[PDB]
């Protein structure tokens, strides 16, 4: 049983030959699926970024020249056939509407007398993934889930509100190996745009007169299941693994599904052939994961096609966490009686092998300071203390709790992230200080911590409002902390402050800058609230907003991406390299996994717990086997020409990923 037919329509730019506008006929919201490339949406995004235009670097001996195609030599009256010529290379674009889908074929032909090598070959696909405001986002923008799957590459653009129709792009000839991001910066809408995506073809060697062809289909679809079915119908494949992060010794099952059986399907594991089993239209590999590190599974099929999955093998998860807490204790806690920040857990430069003192220039000093998000290290050590009872952690926590109470907060519970207290008074910071205090009660017993938690939340309520959207508002912990102490006058007063927050979230709905870590913590809060009160109005709102949360997450066969929310700015604001661009994973992705944990308790639907476990498991790649950590993985091949695919060398705020990992897996 299903729904509507939405033929792809477009406007061709008569000067460039690019697709200016991409719409789905019969869409009641008439969304343009690409960023407008005439300056009218963003001043700095002009016609050179139009859909179907692109670039390559041509190398002949010592001669290296980058070329960008933009002005056709020939263009059809309808714009469906376009020919560009840049040096020796002809770029021919053929477009057709086949049964309501757009089929585009790009050919690259060496017209010259000498062989040529082409590097960094890419086509712009400027999907409308940006965040101008909540109303436009929900109705008229799309989360763009990109899979660099070679011959089986795709893009699944889910409208942010989850209203159908959605859009899909499936590669049916040639391959896409990666993508790049263009037009990011402090002067280019900052955190509010994902930028302009370009999809990278393989590097080519073209003899005189030889061609390389890329073909894709663009089409409307009705959601992830529909997208996957259509992807298969168009002759592509879907790769998936039982999971994407393994402990050493575990068995992996990697599956490659097609519509019809693949011919001569072969596979490799880090470049080494491994046996593939074929049953009908499933090929699968089953192997032990015997060595720590990256594992890439490649499938080779139908003569010249390939695709892959990215998995990670860690030594052991318990030990990874232990080693990380020891590193926080022995290397990221300031132990200098002379320094005003004495007890703090702090930002750490992994290249420099020292605590980062926030004294050199950078783009935003307050995001590299002594508190604010850095409280997650405290919550992590507390949770790890509860599971192991290492007295050296108790000693370190006692000192941290003193640093926070004595130096970050005033006597009146006004909360800062800096010992001087002459910087921003935020809102977000109060929830984590509060969570640290309630958590410290479980360590010792002192009911004073519990009062500090309450008086911190009350100070936030006084100053900011009742409907302040904020990450990790500690409802279930707050109340169990109060009740367990026996301060029953407080377990009602606070509960009623949370209930007044619940109702304002319910009144707002999806109206409220739009991003993952506004939407998700709202739902985290309303789900904990329902578990305490029982009020059906709150669980109703959770269910209504769940699809909107889920739309941030792809199902690509990579531990970097699988159920990992699209976030693309924290590298700039929190990292050493200060790179805007896709961070996969970034640790706040694990809030979504917290939502799924609670949602699984609210309903009895245990498949949300399995998903919860998947999300947090995938964030384990931010933690290394010597106890070091990274604040972000920069995912794309390049960002504005700057090479990415690296872990940012600062350990900053990422330890919340382990906080939510232990919540999901141990209830802590």
């Amino acid at each position: 049983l299903s729904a509507g037919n939405f033929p792809v329509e477009m406007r061709i730019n008569p000067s460039t030959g690019a697709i200016s506008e991409l719409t789905l006929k019969g869409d009641n919201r008439s969304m343009n699926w690409v960023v407008k490339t005439d300056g009218t949406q963003y001043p700095w995004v002009k016609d050179n970024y139009g859909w179907g235009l692109g670039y390559f670097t041509v190398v002949k001996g010592r001669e290296t020249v980058k070329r960008e195609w933009r002005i056709p030599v020939e263009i059809s009256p309808d714009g469906m056939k376009v020919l560009y010529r840049e040096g020796d290379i002809r770029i021919l674009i053929k477009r057709e509407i086949k049964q309501g889908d757009l089929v585009e074929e790009y050919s690259f032909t060496n017209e010259g007398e000498e062989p040529v090598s082409l590097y960094d070959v890419a086509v712009y696909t400027p999907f409308n993934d940006n965040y101008p405001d909540a109303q436009q986002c929900i109705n008229s923008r799309a989360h763009t889930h990109i899979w660099k799957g070679g011959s089986a590459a795709y893009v699944n653009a889910i409208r942010m509100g989850d209203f159908t129709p959605h859009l899909g792009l499936v590669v049916t000839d040639g391959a896409i190996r990666n993508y790049e991001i263009w037009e990011r910066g402090r002067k280019k809408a900052n955190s509010q745009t994902r930028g302009i995506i370009a999809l990278d073809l393989p590097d080519l060697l073209l003899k005189p007169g030889e061609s390389y062809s890329l073909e894709w289909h663009v089409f409307a679809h009705n959601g992830n299941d529909d997208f996957r079915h259509k992807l298969l119908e168009k002759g592509s494949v879907l790769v998936s693994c039982n999971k994407y992060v393994f402990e050493k010794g575990e068995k992996a099952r990697v599956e490659c599904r097609s519509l019809e059986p693949l011919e001569a399907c072969t596979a490799k594991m880090n470049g080494v052939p491994v046996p593939v089993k074929q049953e009908g239209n499933l090929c699968f590999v089953e192997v032990p994961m015997e060595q720590a590190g990256e594992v890439r599974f490649d499938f080779y099929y139908n003569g010249n096609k390939q695709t892959h999955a990215d998995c990670l093998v860690i030594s052991n998860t318990a030990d990874l966490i232990r080693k990380r807490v020891d590193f926080i204790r022995t290397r990221q806690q300031m132990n200098n009686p002379s320094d005003l920040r004495d007890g703090a857990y702090m930002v750490y430069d992994n290249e420099g092998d020292s605590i980062y003192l926030n004294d050199t220039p950078n783009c935003n000093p307050v995001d590299r300071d002594e508190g604010a998000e850095r409280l997650g290290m405290g919550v992590l050590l507390v949770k790890q203390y509860l599971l192991t009872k290492d007295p050296e952690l108790k000693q370190s926590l006692l000192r941290y709790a003193d640093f926070v109470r004595r130096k970050l907060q005033t006597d009146n519970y006004v909360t800062y992230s800096s010992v001087d207290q002459k910087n921003r008074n935020r809102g977000y910071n109060y929830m984590w200080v509060a969570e640290l205090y309630f958590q410290m009660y479980k360590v010792t017993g002192d009911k004073q911590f519990v009062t500090d938690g309450y008086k911190t939340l009350k100070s936030m309520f006084q100053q900011f409002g009742y409907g302040f959207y904020a990450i990790g508002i500690p409802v279930r912990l707050g109340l169990q902390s109060l009740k367990e102490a026996g301060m029953k006058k407080e377990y009602t007063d606070l509960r009623n402050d949370f209930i007044k927050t619940g109702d304002v979230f319910v009144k707002n709905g999806l109206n409220y800058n739009y991003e993952q870590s506004i939407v998700a913590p709202a739902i985290q809060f309303l789900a904990q609230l329902y578990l305490e009160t029982g009020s059906q109005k709150y669980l109703d709102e959770v269910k209504r907003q769940m699809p909107v949360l889920e739309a941030f997450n792809g199902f690509q066969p990579s531990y970097h991406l699988n159920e990992v929310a699209i976030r693309h700015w924290d590298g700039h604001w929190f990292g050493k390299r200060e790179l805007f661009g896709d961070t996969f994973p970034h640790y706040w992705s694990t809030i979504t996994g917290a939502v799924y944990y609670y949602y699984a308790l609210c309903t009895g639907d245990s498949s949300y717990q399995k998903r919860a476990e998947n999300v947090v498991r995938n964030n384990l790649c931010l933690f290394f086997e010597d106890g070091k950590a990274s604040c972000a993985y920069m995912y794309p091949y390049k960002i504005d020409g700057v090479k990415a695919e690296f872990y940012d060398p600062y350990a900053n705020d990422q330890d919340w990923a382990l906080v939510y990992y232990l919540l999901v897996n141990r209830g802590l």
Side-chain angles (χ1 to χ4, degrees), residues 138-289 291-296:
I138 286 293
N139 297 124
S140 319
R141 302 291 183 281
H143 295 309
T144 304
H145 301 290
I146 302 165
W147 181 231
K148 64 182 188 187
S151 315
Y154 66 78
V155 187
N156 181 20
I158 304 301
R159 199 198 302 268
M160 306 193 175
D162 202 56
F163 307 122
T164 58
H166 301 116
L167 199 72
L169 180 157
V170 165
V171 173
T172 54
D173 196 17
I176 293 295
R177 62 163 174 89
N178 219 311
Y179 72 93
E180 302 173 70
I181 290 301
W182 292 106
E183 303 296 328
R184 301 292 250 117
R186 69 175 176 84
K187 306 212 175 89
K188 301 180 189 195
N190 196 49
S191 295
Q192 255 83 264
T193 183
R194 201 164 167 188
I196 302 304
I197 297 145
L199 304 175
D200 299 315
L201 286 69
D203 291 341
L204 307 162
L205 176 53
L206 295 186
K207 293 180 180 69
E210 277 183 353
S211 270
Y212 181 81
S213 251
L214 174 67
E215 189 191 62
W216 55 50
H217 287 43
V218 176
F219 57 87
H221 69 83
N222 204 60
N224 295 144
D225 280 331
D226 193 37
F227 174 79
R228 283 187 287 255
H229 287 308
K230 286 178 156 66
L231 179 147
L232 292 169
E233 292 167 6
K234 294 157 194 311
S236 189
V237 310
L238 278 169
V239 174
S240 60
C241 313
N242 56 315
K243 43 180 148 180
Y244 298 98
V245 174
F246 295 85
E247 303 197 322
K248 206 171 75 168
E250 286 196 275
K251 289 188 270 203
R253 185 197 167 86
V254 187
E255 298 189 341
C256 175
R257 165 153 269 120
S258 54
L259 190 67
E260 287 298 334
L262 303 184
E263 298 313 312
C265 191
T266 252
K268 294 181 184 188
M269 182 178 92
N270 291 159
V272 178
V274 287
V276 180
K277 291 152 193 311
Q278 178 164 57
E279 187 60 56
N281 58 21
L282 179 63
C283 291
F284 64 93
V285 172
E286 298 199 303
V287 292
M289 297 300 250
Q291 190 178 279
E294 196 66 15
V295 182
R296 186 183 160 108

Side-chain angles (χ1 to χ4, degrees), residues 643-661:
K643 186 70 194 69
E645 315 196 86
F646 67 86
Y647 289 102
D648 186 273
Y650 280 2
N652 188 323
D653 36 345
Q654 69 293 317
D655 292 299
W656 291 103
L658 296 184
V659 170
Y660 289 109
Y661 179 96

Side-chain angles (χ1 to χ4, degrees), residues 560-589:
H560 294 283
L561 310 176
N562 195 85
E563 304 204 83
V564 176
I566 291 166
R567 302 180 57 78
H568 51 73
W569 55 91
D570 291 290
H572 186 276
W573 298 112
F574 295 88
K576 187 142 140 96
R577 302 289 181 76
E578 305 181 1
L579 258 189
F580 281 117
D582 298 349
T583 56
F584 282 120
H586 182 265
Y587 74 91
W588 283 144
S589 73

Side-chain angles (χ1 to χ4, degrees), residues 439-445 448-453 456-457 459-461 463-480 482 485-487 490 492-499 501-506 508-517 519-531 533-536 538-625:
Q439 288 289 353
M440 286 302 292
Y441 161 92
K442 299 197 188 197
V443 177
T444 44
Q448 181 60 37
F449 287 129
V450 179
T451 295
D452 295 310
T456 303
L457 293 170
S459 168
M460 182 256 122
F461 291 132
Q463 297 183 248
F464 287 98
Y466 273 99
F468 199 79
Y469 292 91
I471 304 154
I473 305 191
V475 176
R476 200 182 68 168
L477 179 74
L479 302 184
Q480 177 72 45
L482 276 46
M487 299 177 45
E490 305 308 313
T492 303
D493 172 32
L494 194 64
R495 168 158 171 161
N496 274 66
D497 286 64
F498 292 151
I499 286 167
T501 305
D503 294 18
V504 56
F505 290 166
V506 169
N508 289 346
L510 311 160
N511 296 310
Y512 302 98
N513 306 133
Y514 190 92
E515 62 174 62
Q516 141 74 358
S517 57
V519 174
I523 300 166
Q524 195 187 8
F525 176 80
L526 290 174
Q528 288 169 288
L529 194 59
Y530 168 83
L531 284 181
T533 69
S535 158
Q536 209 68 9
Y538 302 136
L539 185 56
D540 277 30
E541 187 62 29
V542 166
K543 292 168 178 277
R544 206 191 329 286
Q545 291 195 351
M546 203 69 162
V548 175
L549 185 60
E550 291 172 359
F552 285 94
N553 290 22
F555 54 82
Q556 303 99 319
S558 175
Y559 63 93
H560 294 283
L561 310 176
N562 195 85
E563 304 204 83
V564 176
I566 291 166
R567 302 180 57 78
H568 51 73
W569 55 91
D570 291 290
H572 186 276
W573 298 112
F574 295 88
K576 187 142 140 96
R577 302 289 181 76
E578 305 181 1
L579 258 189
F580 281 117
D582 298 349
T583 56
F584 282 120
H586 182 265
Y587 74 91
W588 283 144
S589 73
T590 69
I591 303 165
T592 298
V595 167
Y596 295 170
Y597 162 83
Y598 286 126
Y599 190 84
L601 295 184
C602 284
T603 73
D605 186 352
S606 80
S607 85
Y608 277 93
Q609 179 56 31
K610 297 297 171 209
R611 290 169 65 178
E613 293 166 14
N614 180 58
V615 178
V616 297
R617 171 156 35 68
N618 288 345
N619 282 256
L620 295 171
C621 66
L622 301 172
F623 304 91
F624 314 120
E625 302 271 23

